[PDB]
Write a protein that binds this DNA or RNA. Structure first.
Ligand SMILES: COc1ccc2ncc(C#N)c(CCN3CCC(NCc4cc5c(cn4)OCS5)CC3)c2c1
Lengths: 718, 719
DNA sequence: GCCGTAGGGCCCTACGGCT
DNA sequence: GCCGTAGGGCCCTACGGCT
């Protein structure tokens, strides 16, 4: 797969390790054929710190680098017989590019150690944006720097900001004239200072020990601050190996945390999800209108909101639509959206999809100045930092995904429960954990099934950590003539039916369990979930069954770990703080959704007041306009001689003729007097903290009766 | 393996489906009665076992797979008692490629599996390809023809809710178990065999290697209209002659391939895929002034609206259109790694962005003033265009090079100032001859430039539609000292892999089948043009080796012309003159109806302003007349009876804003009122005189020749 | 191992006309 | 065994908490 140059002189010869063949495209085009070589890798590479001796060598890419440098490794190294005297590390400039760097560097160190020291290893720096302002072009290398500048350029003659998710996305000359041309390039030399301090740093971030890694996050983080970026960064183009690993790994881990794996506490959506649901609402794809194809929403959410490859956007939009994964689906689906047998939905190309009615409630009131918008990834479009979520989607559905130094897992809850539960907290602020558990009995799943005890549920709700045991629903039925058989008709959340059956059949071939004649899956669309275990003559099933809960996954544990995002930060929280934050949302939403309904009833009546005057001094107005000539001077004639403002003169001249009927004069005073009542219901909702929190209560009772459904998981007490 | 079997292991009750791929082979696992119904996904088209050498099929992956699941053996060792299903259902997606797939399956079945068909084992399920809905009524339908019939057989006062079904993935497992797999409702067809020699006659004919025989076939059972062609009675039994399934399925497919996939219309020189991309670029305001948009965004847009087939071919075609070494005049704009001469494709949709070239606007010029014809799309939710206003001879400009069924096209790109000069010559003299046109149109003009040998090949091409041209890489010979020399290649023959080309060269040298050479270096780079180097062994002869290479490699390669296109709906082989007249004809009409449109809307705007003239001059009496009108219906039937104003007049009067009762805005009217009565004039003239119009068309093709007119690249060595 | 967002990229196959 | 539209699809990797 390697692409080499013409030369065979190690001194001047070099090599750019790139992400892929896609990015390594622009690379082979803008290079100098005589002296620069390219090596296409594949995505993230094996973090050699964690994996073993035999498996580190069987890695195909690690061998293509070994061969290419032609040195061997460990103690059979030989820096004498090296093909290139410059190993450049050119990874895409976005965050994931840096996590690559760190792996490559990791590898370089533990095997090709003497190479970093002799200064042969290097780091390339390709841009990640290109702001334009006339003849002015700027090159910013990460989201943080773009914040700064996007606010330093007072002038504002309009910008056209680019952005370069890959290397494949640059013209093959932008990538010579910013990254490869040995007369402009800011190539950074990898130098080794303090070998004892490297070995701690590697162990910290590439080492198995998860804790020290997390510590290291809360130690070095920086959340909402623009005051960062400071400063000098010495005008020399070398970099300390530690000074960089330390940085680039964190620039990564922070990103994976604030906007990737974990949910906001209000809406409860990781960013990919929140974007999809918005991108649906935008393009109009609502529940009343036809299904729209899936590569039309996935290609449209990519190019408008969310800069990452499809097999992430789609496989995510999918779950949101499944009834076995989302307790309350947010996406209605047409097509093969996959099964509980581990098989996955049919490709983007086939399936169609829209909103569910319940996802309109997340977006209710979103265009009405409630939540805040941040510019998308390229300054062309306007997107949401969070949605008005008029239900606690965080709990209601609950998410779970792996980050760095921390992971999360939150079970889904019944909504009538969650709402009866929040209504009680707005009544009583001082509420106790145990009291809330009268309304909110605990996890309600999609899959149904059973939970064995509040001993592990109570633990979770109180702290945020607790093991919950899950047992499937199973009947011991008989079929006459002497024999019994088992029937499972509900299963544990997140369990591969067909993978389980295998681990059951496995223990039978291997005689690790006795009394089973045959195994069978009889599940099908009309008989719901149904797995049948044929059991031997009489030998008591109750013991094999109570053996099946033990050995296999007919019984497993939800390891809870409630870690959401509160005010931009990864805070581990409990049942109560989840509701206090989510209700603070509703309180704030419904608040601004009144300051908005207010300033509009205000200017509309500001309008109407000029409308009523032009009616009863009518023929005075007409000969006032007709005498006038231009539109610049027709504003003047009515602002002076009738005492009317500007937004009251324009909306008078802009008015049509059909309004001059004798019926609309008496329809205005009655629409105007529908306003003075409507404004009276606003100003005494702002000066009254209580009538508004009352109103929130009113809307959420509505949300509960319209959508709120029955329990699925039965809790077996004791 | 790869096979999801069923519970019961008793053949005579157990059936296995064969679906196209895992995607729709899971809309099935989720529909099935896992007790008796077994699924085996394939993986798209499986090989055509007639066009195949025996030892190959015994090494194909999805054939060894079916043999196992049946469990019967093949040919001479085929045993029928050993079968594990007594119903092998062919169940492939509803579309036209599931048609093709179906013929390749039966063809295999018939070749080695004959005994299996012959005892009523092989069946054929019928999955819907549509689902129109008029309130209560849910009708299904299984091809595009059957749908046109039904869209003219309904009193459309319900308004349709048509839904398509690209595959089985697009189907919820219930509405597929129902319609297609339920022993209660389902309508499987049993595969019977009649005259064995009349079967064997359709297999070596349809799925054979006799290209002529198969085209003839097409030309005979054609149908293109198709008006309202035959029905009845489809014998109310669920049987089906094999020798008939080959004929309609294969034909009904080669039909779709030919008229709407792999062959270019003549009026705009575009396959349907292309037309679809460029239209969709036009729909999103993705013109050359606004920014580049991510590839996924367009391709995902074009696919859900216009072209229901894979991204992989929508993209790769969108790429060919944007790269300067294939499209002589690129119609798309490249921002990214959009490939190289070396045979290396672009970067997945998520990387690259794009928009229209300026030249593409000419194609899509006037597409909105009613000039070309607007059809429905594949799901009847929206409008798409049948063909573009193509304001330049795109077919010949850029050409095309696609493979249909039974036939194949190949047209080379031409220089554009040549083409319009050639078209202008035709407009002045309907009878102008081939030779006379070849004084403007010297020959093919490539993006790789280079040379051609003679016109005796060019000339056969243009006068019939067939002919063979020879293509010469632009070589040159130079010295590097002292005494020794070397050969430099600045341009290469349109459409060869400059890397495999070099590779080939190297091969003849590593195995000693050509003498003279010593070193071979590729030295092309972005900044310094194309350039490939050969080192001469001193004293040896350079002209001899350069000639030797032309023969023994793709240094000298040949483009055989085959000018086949879609004329008036059908595959016609055409010459240079025909290609121009039809295109000119198109250009004549496109203009004629633009003019018509402008005029209708010029009179519609004129009757408006006319009632706005009774309105302003008579401004006063209307005040008194509206201040008395109460309702809205009474304020209309007033100014109709008192000022002879139509309904669109008393209307566009109640529609009026008071800000126009100002002083200067009584002249804005008359000033452009007269300008309009005079503008109406300019158009009726164009419409009444055939030549006045035709002259206008001339000056518009001229306008365009000066803007996008550019030098020739390919040179024409005389011989 | 396995979950869920994210990096990354390769093979079969049909079809016609040509060395 | 290649030109270009079309059918179809599977695999390596990181990251953290738990059997
Ligand atoms: C599917 O099974 C295999 C087997 C081997 C492979 N080897 C190399 C590669 C690659 N690259 C793929 C990728 C194939 N897939 C990757 C995902 C692509 N995604 C489709 C898609 C659709 C749209 C889109 C982007 N991608 O934007 C708007 S609509 C389709 C090709 C393979 C896939």
């Amino acid at each position: 797969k390697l692409a080499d140059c013409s030369s065979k002189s190690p001194e001047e010869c070099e090599i750019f390790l790139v992400e892929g063949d896609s990015a390594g495209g622009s690379t082979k085009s803008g290079r100098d054929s005589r002296t620069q070589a390219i090596l296409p890798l594949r995505g993230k590479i094996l973090n050699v710190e964690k994996a073993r001796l035999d498996r580190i060598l069987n890695n195909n890419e690690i061998r293509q680098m070994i061969t290419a440098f032609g040195t061997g490794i460990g103690g059979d190294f030989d820096l004498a017989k090296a093909r290139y005297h410059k190993i450049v590390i050119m990874t895409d400039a976005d965050v994931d590019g840096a996590h690559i760097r760190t792996l490559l560097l990791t590898f370089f160190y533990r095997f090709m150690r003497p190479l970093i020291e002799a200064g042969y290893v290097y780091i390339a720096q390709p841009p990640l944006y290109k702001l334009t302002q006339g003849k002015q072009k700027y090159y910013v290398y990460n989201d943080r720097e773009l914040d700064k500048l996007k606010s330093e350029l007072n002038p504002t003659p309009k910008w056209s900001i680019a952005r370069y998710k890959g290397l494949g996305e640059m013209n093959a000359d932008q990538l010579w004239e910013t990254t490869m041309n040995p007369e402009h390039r800011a190539l950074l030399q990898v130098k080794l200072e303090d070998a004892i301090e490297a070995d701690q740093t590697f162990e910290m971030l590439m080492g198995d020990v998860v804790e020290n890694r997390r510590q290291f996050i809360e130690d070095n983080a920086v959340y909402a601050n623009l005051d960062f970026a400071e400063l000098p960064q010495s005008r020399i183009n070398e970099r300390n190996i530690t000074s960089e690993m330390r940085e680039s790994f964190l620039d990564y881990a922070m990103s994976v945390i604030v906007a990737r794996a974990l949910p906001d506490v209000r809406d409860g959506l990781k960013p990919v999800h929140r974007r999809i649901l918005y991108g649906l609402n935008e393009q109009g794809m609502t529940p009343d209108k036809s299904y729209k194809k899936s590569a039309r929403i996935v290609g449209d959410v990519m190019g408008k909101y969310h800069p990452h490859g499809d097999s992430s956007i789609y496989e995510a939009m999918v779950r949101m639509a499944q009834d076995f994964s989302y307790r309350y689906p947010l996406v209605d689906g047409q097509g093969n959206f996959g099964s509980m047998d581990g098989d996955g939905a049919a490709a983007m190309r086939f399936t169609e999809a829209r909103m569910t009615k319940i996802t309109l409630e997340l977006l209710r009131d979103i265009n009405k100045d409630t939540i805040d918008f941040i510019d998308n990834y390229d300054g062309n479009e306007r997107e949401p930092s969070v949605l008005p979520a008029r239900f606690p989607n965080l709990l209601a559905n609950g998410a779970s995904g792996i980050a760095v130094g921390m992971a999360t897992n939150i079970p889904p809850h019944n909504l009538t429960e969650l709402i009866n539960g929040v209504l009680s907290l707005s009544k009583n602020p001082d509420i106790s954990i145990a009291e809330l558990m009268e309304d909110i009995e605990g996890p309600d799943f999609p899959t149904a099934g059973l939970i064995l005890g509040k001993s592990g549920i109570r633990r979770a709700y109180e702290t945020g950590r607790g093991s919950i045991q899950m047992r499937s629903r199973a009947v011991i039925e008989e079929r006459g003539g002497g024999r019994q058989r088992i029937v499972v008709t509900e299963i544990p959340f997140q369990v591969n039916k067909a993978r389980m059956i295998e681990k059951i059949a496995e223990l039978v071939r291997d005689k690790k369990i006795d009394g089973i004649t045959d195994l069978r899956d009889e599940t099908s669309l009309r008989t719901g979930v149904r797995v049948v275990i044929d059991v031997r003559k009489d030998a008591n099933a109750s013991v094999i069954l109570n053996n099946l809960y033990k050995q296999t996954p007919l019984q497993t544990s939800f390891g809870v770990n409630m870690i959401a995002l509160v005010n931009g930060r990864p805070k581990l929280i409990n049942l109560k703080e989840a509701l206090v934050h989510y209700l603070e949302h509703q309180k704030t939403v419904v608040r601004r959704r009144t300051q908005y309904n207010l300033r509009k009833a205000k200017d509309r009546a500001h309008i109407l007041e000029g409308l009523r005057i032009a009616l009863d001094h009518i023929d005075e107005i007409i000969s006032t306009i007709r005498e006038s000539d231009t539109d610049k001077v027709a504003m003047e004639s009515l602002q002076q001689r009738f005492k009317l403002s500007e937004k009251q003169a324009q909306a008078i001249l802009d008015m049509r003729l059909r309004r001059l009927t004798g019926l609309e004069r008496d329809k205005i005073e009655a629409e105007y007097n529908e306003l003075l009542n409507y404004i009276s219901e606003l100003e005494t909702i702002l000066a009254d903290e209580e009538v508004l929190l009352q109103l929130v209560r009113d809307e959420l009772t509505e949300i509960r009766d319209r959508f709120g459904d029955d329990r699925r998981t039965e809790i077996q007490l004791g």
